[PDB]
Amino acid sequence: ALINPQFPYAGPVPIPGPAPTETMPLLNYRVEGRIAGIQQARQFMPFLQGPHRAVAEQTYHAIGTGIQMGQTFNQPLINTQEG
Amino acid sequence: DKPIYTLQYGNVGFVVNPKTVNQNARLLMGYEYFTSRT
């Protein structure tokens, strides 16, 4: 702010002001609020809580069976070298 | 890969069972073989 003498800035907005209204009042709000609809315990989703496999491992079962059977052919006898 | 070798599995033979046999018929045998330290 600058004040300049001799033209000085009025020393106030004075008493000639026009009170325009008495509408100043905010009427307090008084209220009762009830949000009470029956609630049912459940919601349907496509899927909740699953941690789906991105790849599975290979998996398997097992079997064996049979017996011990055989047809054989042997090497001929040979002269013994030494000993 | 598995050469015929008697003494490894008894005598072995090459077999031909002919359907027709003309006069003077015969089998001409050709062999390729190794004969090592033994």
At B6, list the tokens.
């008697």
* Resolution for this experimental structure (Å): 4.2
Tell me if B6 sits within 8 A of A73, measured CB to CB: no
For chain A, state the CA radius of gyration. 53
> CB-based contacts of A31: which residues, under 8 Å, 6+ apart?
none
Experimental technique for the deposited model: X-ray
**Alpha helices (runs of H) in chain A, residue ranges in sequence order:** none
Asked if residue B37 lies in contact with residue A78, where contact means CB atoms within 8 angstroms, the answer is no
Find tokens 């330290």 and name the residue: B37
B7 touches chain A (CB under 8 A): yes
Residues of B in contact with A76 (CB under 8 A): 6-7, 10
Which residues of chain A neighbour B8 with C-beta distances below 8 Å? 75
